[PDB]
Design a protein around this ligand. Structure first.
Ligand SMILES: CN(C)Cc1cnn(-c2ccnc3[nH]c(-c4cccc5c4ccn5C)nc23)c1
Length: 267
């Protein structure tokens, strides 16, 4: 869990800027490992994000190496070299439909594991999905994540914090209730972003205008060239009624079966 500052080498060039993300190298027992380091320079929030990540073990979720207490509080993670999925797709508009399906299916597998483990992510967006390879996605950014109480299937927040409203379900907005079904709503927005090659959702609209549009039963249109079955799935993720909205087990199954058909049809 606690790492030696002497064994960490930080590169001066910053990956992101929320906080700062730096590429680094950490000397392990024999080999050196490439890492991405979250720097604080708020201290209890980093420790709680570390607390969440240490409990998670899945191929589709970013692996935490440990924490470092030196100049600043640092969260050291295994490096996903290709970066955020939204920026990747913005810069690589030639990515095939079968490939986007493959990646959003990998996110659903990671979320199906988070659901089973009774953790709510609460920041599922394309900017928080990292690419290991063009064919391998991992979920990151557990800063807002919560381990659900054993007797409840939702987390209740106290007062509006720093929230990404465009990705949030109506029960999150109106009742401050976060469940794995509210993460399914964000997964629908993330899917829309993915088939829109990293375009921002609800472009040019204020959070309040997004709320009002959703309350009238309106939803973002079908992205250019997005498969119909995938757009039907987003709409099912955007079911207003929490009870009728599918869970991640159901969403993953639809993605699995559809992806196996696309792979078949290809060759
Ligand atoms: C808002 N969150 C996305 C911040 C955050 C949290 N974890 N985390 C990373 C964890 C593991 N592997 C990574 N790899 C890259 C990376 C690689 C290449 C380019 C990149 C990035 C990040 C920005 N850019 C432009 N970031 C990470 C980044």
């Amino acid at each position: 869990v606690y790492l030696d500052r002497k064994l960490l080498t930080l590169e001066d060039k910053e990956l992101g800027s929320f906080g700062t993300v730096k590429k680094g190298y950490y000397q392990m027992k024999k080999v050196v490992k490439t890492v991405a380091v979250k720097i604080l320079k708020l201290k209890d929030e980093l420790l709680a994000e570390a607390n969440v990540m240490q409990q998670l073990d899945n191929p589709y979720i970013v692996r935490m190496i440990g924490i470092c207490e030196a100049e600043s509080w640092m969260l050291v993670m295994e490096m996903a070299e290709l970066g955020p999925l939204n920026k990747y797709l913005q810069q690589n508009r030639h990515v095939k439909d079968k490939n986007i399906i493959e990646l959003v299916h990998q996110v659903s597998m990671g979320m199906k594991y988070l659901e089973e483990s009774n953790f709510v992510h609460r920041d599922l967006a394309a900017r928080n999905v990292l690419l290991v390879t063009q064919h391998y996605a991992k979920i990151s950014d557990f800063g807002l994540s919560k381990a659900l109480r054993a007797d409840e299937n939702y987390y209740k927040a106290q007062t509006h914090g720093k929230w990404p409203v465009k990705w949030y379900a109506p029960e999150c907005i109106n009742y401050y209730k976060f469940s794995s079904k509210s993460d399914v709503w964000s997964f629908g927005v993330l899917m829309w972003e993915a088939f829109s090659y990293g375009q921002k959702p609800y472009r040019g609209m204020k959070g309040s205008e997004v709320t009002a549009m959703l309350e009238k039963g309106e939803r973002m249109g079908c992205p250019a060239g997005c498969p119909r079955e995938m757009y039907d799935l987003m709409n099912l993720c955007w079911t207003y009624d929490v009870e009728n909205r599918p869970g991640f087990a159901a969403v993953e199954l639809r993605l699995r079966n559809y992806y196996y058909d696309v792979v078949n049809h290809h060759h």
